[PDB]
Design a protein around this ligand. Sequence first.
Ligand code: AGS
Ligand code: MG
Lengths: 210, 187
Amino acid sequence: MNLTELKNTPVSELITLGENMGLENLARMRKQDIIFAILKQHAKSGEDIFGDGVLEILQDGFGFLRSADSSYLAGPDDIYVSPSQIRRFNLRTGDTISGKIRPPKEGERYFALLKVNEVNFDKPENARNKILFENLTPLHANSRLRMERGNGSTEDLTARVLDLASLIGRGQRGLIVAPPKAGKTMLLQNIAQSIAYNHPDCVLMVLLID
Amino acid sequence: TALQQAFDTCQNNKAAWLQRKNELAAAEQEYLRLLSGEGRNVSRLDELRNIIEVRKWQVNQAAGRYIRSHEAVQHISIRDRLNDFMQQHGTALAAALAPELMGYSELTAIARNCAIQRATDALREALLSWLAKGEKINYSAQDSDILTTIGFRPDVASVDDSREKFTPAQNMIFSRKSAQLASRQSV
Ligand SMILES: Nc1ncnc2c1ncn2[C@@H]1O[C@H](COP(=O)(O)OP(=O)(O)OP(O)(O)=S)[C@@H](O)[C@H]1O
Ligand SMILES: [Mg+2]
């Protein structure tokens, strides 16, 4: 089946479903190994298996496919991608790929990508004739990105202050300088909640380091 | 023969101002309709407000241009009617106003403009006394149709929408915004 749903499921029911349909011991190893084993056995059963994620090209033009749920770990469940598919479907680095996948055979140990059904959420042939990001000409921020929820929340005050403090728009390059113990993380919480509420169409990404 | 071109310019400026009014009204009613809706398209509302501001500035500019064209048409029509009235009654006006008029021919600029202002004052009391009867003043022979189509005064909307004035900073920012909107419409 589609590995995304089972990957998003917590470990307890993953273990119980591994054990209830013909597995020996799954409790005492990592989640990635559990997913790899259950995918291998389900593929040996014979049903179709689906995968999706983000493509990474190594230094030799050789492709892995990672999952955003695992925060792009180099887990055993990463999808094999040969350079032939990269050159034939003509992808980039960081594309979003979804399609049927192939169980590994002798000589390899990651699941291979059989066929692609969607690249960056549109038709695969439509991806080839796409314009590069660097070729795009930049501009200034035009569309206002309001940071007011409008629900009259008690904490919404903070977000309201942001609207009174600085103007944020699409394409804006923003910096928040602050010493430790100043509320940066929950200010980011408020910003993310405001983006999710007021603007549910724009893609929201929250990146954390160390 | 420039009066016909001036009339055409006034007509097309009027048409531009009217059409500006039409898309301003359309954007206004669409924005009120979206406000009446329960959608959470806040960014849509912000860009709609930006559109309202840009269209209001465009309407003000078009109204100002139309007013300027109307004044130019009135001035040129008055000048032409003045010329073809004076080419008829210049000798009579000169006979009735003679002293300062042959004073102009050899006096210095100070005496020249003193006589000019004396004559204009005298005709000022002349007109204010003549207008006592106040009969129905008719237009001229061939410019009557032009003056009727242009009208005695411009529309009340085209003058009240121009009460607000913008400093050159606002003019520059709204010109940039209008150019950006034109680029958006083109794409
Ligand atoms: N809007 C707020 N309402 C209530 N408490 C707040 C608010 N903003 C900050 N605080 C308090 O600020 C303290 C620190 O909050 P944090 O967001 O963890 O600070 P920080 O900027 O993230 O610094 P770090 O993450 O510890 S390095 C906590 O005690 C919070 O309760
Ligand atoms: Mg924090």
